[PDB]
Amino acid sequence: DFDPTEFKGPFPTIEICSKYCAVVCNYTSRPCYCVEAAKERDQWFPYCYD
Numbered sequence: 287d288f289d290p291t292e293f294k295g296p297f298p299t300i301e302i303c304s305k306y307c308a309v310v311c312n313y314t315s316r317p318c319y320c321v322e323a324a325k326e327r328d329q330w331f332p333y334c335y336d
Contacts, residue, residue: 306318310332
């Protein structure tokens, strides 16, 4: 994984991360969605990502 916006890890700011998630894997110009890993909860890793 890598955090383009904050540090190195999952996204906090999932709103902007939904945009970033898009540019991350598939949706470079399309809306995208982040999935939240439940253990830490805040693990906003894009639906197609690490």
